[PDB]
Write a protein that binds this DNA or RNA. Structure first.
Ligand SMILES: [Mg+2]
Ligand SMILES: [Mg+2]
Ligand SMILES: [Mg+2]
Ligand SMILES: [Mg+2]
Ligand SMILES: [Mg+2]
Lengths: 336, 107, 156, 109, 51, 58
RNA sequence: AAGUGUACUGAGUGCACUUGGAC
RNA sequence: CCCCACUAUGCUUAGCCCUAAACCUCAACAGUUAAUCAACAAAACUGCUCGCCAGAACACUACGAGCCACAGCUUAAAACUCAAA
RNA sequence: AUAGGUUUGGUCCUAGCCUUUCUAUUAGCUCUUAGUAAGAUUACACAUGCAAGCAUCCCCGUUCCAGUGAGUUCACCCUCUAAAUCACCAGAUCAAAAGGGACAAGCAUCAAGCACGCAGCAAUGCAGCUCAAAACGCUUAGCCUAGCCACACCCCCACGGGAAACAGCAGU
């Protein structure tokens, strides 16, 4: 709303670079936010996404294209690209595309969310031949550099985000800084999985066992237990080290919201290699679920009251395949 | 090659041996799925009994049933060992007569 | 510093001719470099450098003499390509000559340092050891190396 | 004498002088190929302490093991520059030589 | 004792080397006299024709 | 002599020679010019090789 | 006649190349 | 396929792409003619060095990567099959 | 290899595959005795019984033996020098930690690692160090067998937590 009433007026007077966090998948509100002008979608943090199957980059580009179609002209979106400011992947190709065509003339407004990496991308582009070093001007004082001037707008804060609840250290831990390694676990009905102390899943009413592949920060503990012991373990180990997020023990947990419940029913199990659904706990991560053929499973996801739990089509449907072998009686699969 | 080239390239890197039809094991267990006949490549023509069986590793394979007479039926347990048949292209396994549901050759 | 010989300079064959200065100025002009081609200029430059540097300019098969001649040739090729910027054959010849001069300089450095230093000073050749690795500098490698250098500087 | 380093004396070639008072010396040992039975020049890198910084790239040096490793890698001291690069003195006749030709003839004195 | 004998043998071989170098130098000077005569003859003809 | 380092030097000096560096820091220079390979072997054996007595003791 | 490379068209054609063809 | 007209293109400039039966299908260097040798081809070999091959097809292919700046080239597999090629 | 069969209408060459030999596991069918040797597929879970006592009390041992091969260049040599035995000391013996050297296989469609070095008493400076002679990284495997290395349910460790632990014997 603040962006609508302060910055949209300036923007609607040119090119817009809309940055979207690939892991987290504001889009439908763009027509009012920016108006009818040229827009380019940049899927950030691609390096942190595991390569579930060949052509996953193409699949992601496609998925972004249908998302935009759901929300827009293909405001007009003229290009969808995948970039990683941290690794400088695709930045030079983006620069070449920007400079290669007539359509990209005028100023550039870099719009996106707080965690999208706008700061990293702005620094990367500033440290490049694209810019003709940086200045600060009031729009709110914001950074800019000549190219016509590049404009870095304030990040749009995300509502119902676990990062808002988490502290600086907790947010740092939760946010993956290295490439994510999927962690698969074979679960039978009546079992519970704990992604830190933030996310929990209860699998039940399943005609057959299934596989759950957690895609999250490598340093976020994943704990498997029975439904009976799931609670008692939760109270005992809230915070502390077994569930490293949050931190502060009972002191922090007193202020931490309790985990509200949300029921889920999974569609027919599409084999044992194609995920049926990704259950995302806001920005912390997600879990891809593969039931067995024809099997329908009942789930209950417990997520902090303030934040929300989202069931989405699998972002990496073939992520179950990348794995090793079962270790002991433990449900865990050796990570490849 | 020259002596220097041989030294640089080291000893030959013998390729790993490809896993046979039985995935390196002399025998496996399986569940029959569908029995049928097959025609051997010419000049051999006599019909040969084959059965699709799901091994202990999930894989399904066609396995030749040797001898005359049997009772193998759907969802019946058999033991299958390696060994391609002379004149049944593709068939690369054999049910071991005298184990589990494979009542001895019904002579 | 590679100033060319003055045009009036007589050819090598005639600089030793007795009474050459005691003849017509027109004869001197005709015998001079002005009325000669670039090969004569290169030969005179080679003579100049030889007398300047090598201990025994009379020896022409010495390694120092070979290096001097090859350096003269390289200068010639550089001047030629300053104009015929599109001559791939002479570009190749220049690159090969540079490589050969580097090889001869290496040999001289390993054999007679006392004279290698004199060659280098005389011809203004800053000898540089070959790079250890030739790994291609592609976009990703360049960008990541720059980022790592900046990171190290920040840590320092 | 009772040095804790393995190789007491090693002759190598200086291949780097970008370290204060320390010279990067390359040492090559003939090694029997167990199969061909031919000998090849296996090479290892050693760091020699050179207080006087008299090492020049290309010199052939003799390195003596230090009593103890004085750094993470410096385990030898330059005992003697065996062949100063391009300034070789024939040890036999003691006269300077340039490759295979004497500068000062041995009959000079 | 062995090292002393080695040095003695080195001295002996050094004397032999010096003798060889003396003889070779004599022969080289004798031959280079003719070589220098040839060079002078060539130079004189060159200078004469050029003049 | 697996542990005795051996290194070669082609065309470094006008005359050929060997040089042994001992554990005591001593340097033994052996002239090989004009000698046959067998003669060189015998000389080095005499001046630095273990005698058959020592070998038999080992 | 065959084929290599390359490009258009829907097997041919265009350019160069080879004889692994005949005179 | 034949005839007619005409365009890319063949041409100049300035940049790109890097593939050909890019073949004398016979790698560089040195050497020899001593006793011939699968066959054909350009008589047979010796020394020395570098590069390359380890059945066929899958396959100048897929995946990844590089060059691209997106329709392509280079690198280059695996599984399954056969007792051939 | 002392080789053999197999491509074709036929011959020669190149090339793969298969046969012959000796082992080991499993299976079919079959089987008398005696001595000896060896003996879960599973680092999957375990019912049950037992496997650490001795001894005038203190001590000492239960850290060994025994087991497994999950992991994995912690194994070998040299230097130095702990602990232990020599009723005490002795140096001797034994052998830790630490330093130096050595030390498996495949993959380059794993090509760069990203601080991987040095000088200085220190501040601090120098900007270096490894790598196509394979660094870095992924996958596989106990090994070099009088025996050796590693693990001891897992979290590499084990304060702590997960949870109630036969990879000790017999057994399920
Ligand atoms: Mg035209
Ligand atoms: Mg049996
Ligand atoms: Mg443990
Ligand atoms: Mg156990
Ligand atoms: Mg037991």
């Amino acid at each position: 709303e603040q962006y609508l009433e302060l910055v949209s007026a300036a923007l609607r007077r040119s090119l817009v670079l809309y940055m979207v966090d690939l892991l987290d998948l504001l889009l439908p509100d763009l027509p009012a936010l920016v108006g009818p002008k040229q827009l380019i979608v940049l899927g950030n943090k691609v390096d942190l996404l595991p390569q579930d199957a060949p052509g996953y980059r193409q699949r992601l580009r496609e998925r972004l294209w249908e998302d935009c179609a759901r929300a827009l002209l293909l405001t007009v979106v003229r290009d969808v690209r995948l970039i990683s400011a941290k690794t400088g992947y695709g930045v030079e190709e983006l620069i070449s595309a920007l400079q290669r065509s007539w359509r990209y003339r005028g100023d550039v407004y870099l719009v996106g969310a707080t965690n999208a990496g706008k700061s990293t991308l702005f620094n990367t582009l500033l440290e490049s031949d694209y810019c003709t070093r940086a200045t600060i001007s009031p729009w709110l004082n914001l950074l800019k550099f000549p190219i016509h001037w590049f404009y870095d707008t304030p990040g749009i804060t995300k509502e119902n985000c676990i990062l808002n609840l988490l502290t600086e250290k907790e947010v740092n831990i939760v946010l993956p800084t290295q490439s994510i390694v999927p962690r698969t676990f074979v679960l039978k009905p009546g079992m519970v999985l704990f992604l830190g102390a933030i996310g929990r899943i209860d699998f039940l009413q399943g005609n057959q066992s299934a596989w759950f592949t957690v895609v999250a920060s490598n340093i976020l503990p994943v704990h498997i237990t029975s439904l009976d012991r799931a609670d008692a373990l939760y109270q005992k180990h809230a915070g502390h080290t077994l569930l490293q997020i949050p931190m502060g023990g009972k002191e922090r947990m007193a202020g931490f919201p309790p985990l509200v419940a949300e029921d889920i029913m999974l569609k027919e199990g599409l084999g044992a290699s194609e995920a049926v659904a990704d259950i995302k706990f806001s920005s912390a991560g997600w879990v891809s679920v593969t039931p067995n053929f024809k099997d329908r499973l009942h789930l209950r996801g417990y997520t902090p009251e303030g934040t929300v739990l989202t069931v989405r089509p699998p972002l990496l449907p073939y992520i179950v395949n990348i794995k090793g072998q079962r270790i002991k009686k433990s449900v865990a699969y050796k990570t490849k | 090659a020259t002596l220097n080239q041989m030294h640089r390239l080291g000893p030959p890197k013998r390729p790993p041996r490809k896993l046979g039809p039985t995935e390196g094991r002399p025998q496996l267990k399986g569940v029959v799925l569908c029995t049928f006949t097959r025609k051997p490549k010419k000049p051999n023509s006599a019909n040969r009994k084959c059965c699709r069986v799901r091994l202990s590793t999930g894989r399904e394979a066609v396995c030749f049933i040797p001898g005359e007479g049997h009772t193998l039926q759907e969802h019946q347990i058999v033991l299958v060992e390696g060994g391609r048949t002379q004149d049944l292209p593709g068939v690369k396994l054999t049910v071991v007569r005298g184990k589990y549901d494979c009542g001895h050759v019904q002579k | 510093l590679d100033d060319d010989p003055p045009p009036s300079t007589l050819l090598k064959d005639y600089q030793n001719v007795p009474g050459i200065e005691k003849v017509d100025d027109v004869v001197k002009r005709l015998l001079s470099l002005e009325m000669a081609n670039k090969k004569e200029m290169l030969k005179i430059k080679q003579e100049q450098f030889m007398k300047k540097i090598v201990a025994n300019p009379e020896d022409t098969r010495s390694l120092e003499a070979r290096i001097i001649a090859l350096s003269v040739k390289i200068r010639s090729y550089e001047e030629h390509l300053e104009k015929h910027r599109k001559d791939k054959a002479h570009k190749r010849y220049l690159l090969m000559s540079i490589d050969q001069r580097k090889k001869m300089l290496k040999n001289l450095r390993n054999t007679n340092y006392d004279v290698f230093e004199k060659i280098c000073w005389g011809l203004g050749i800053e000898y540089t050891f070959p790079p250890l690795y030739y790994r291609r500098a592609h976009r990703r490698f360049v960008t990541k190396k720059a980022l790592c250098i900046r990171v190290f500087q920040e840590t320092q | 004498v009772r040095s804790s380093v393995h190789a007491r004396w090693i002759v190598g070639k200086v291949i780097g002088t970008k370290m204060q008072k320390t010279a990067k010396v390359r040492v090559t040992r003939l090694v029997l190929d167990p199969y061909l039975l031919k000998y090849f020049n296996k090479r290892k890198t050693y760091f020699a302490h050179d207080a006087l910084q008299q090492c020049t790239v290309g010199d052939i040096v003799l390195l003596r093991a230090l009593p103890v490793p004085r750094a993470k890698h410096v385990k030898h001291e330059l005992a003697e520059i065996v062949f100063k690069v391009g300034k070789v003195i024939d040890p036999v006749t003691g006269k300077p030589c340039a490759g295979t030709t004497y500068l000062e003839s041995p009959l000079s004195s | 004792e062995l090292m002393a004998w080695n040095q003695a043998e080195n001295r002996r071989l050094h004397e032999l080397r010096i003798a060889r170098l003396r003889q070779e130098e004599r022969e080289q000077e004798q031959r280079q006299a003719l070589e220098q005569a040839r060079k002078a003859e060539e130079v004189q003809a060159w200078a004469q024709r050029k003049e | 002599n697996p542990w005795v380092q051996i290194m070669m030097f082609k065309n470094m000096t006008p005359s050929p020679f060997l040089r042994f560096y001992l554990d005591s820091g001593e340097q033994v220079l052996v002239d090989v010019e004009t000698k046959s390979n067998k003669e060189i072997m015998e000389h080095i054996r005499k001046i630095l090789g273990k005698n058959e007595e020592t070998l038999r003791e080992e």
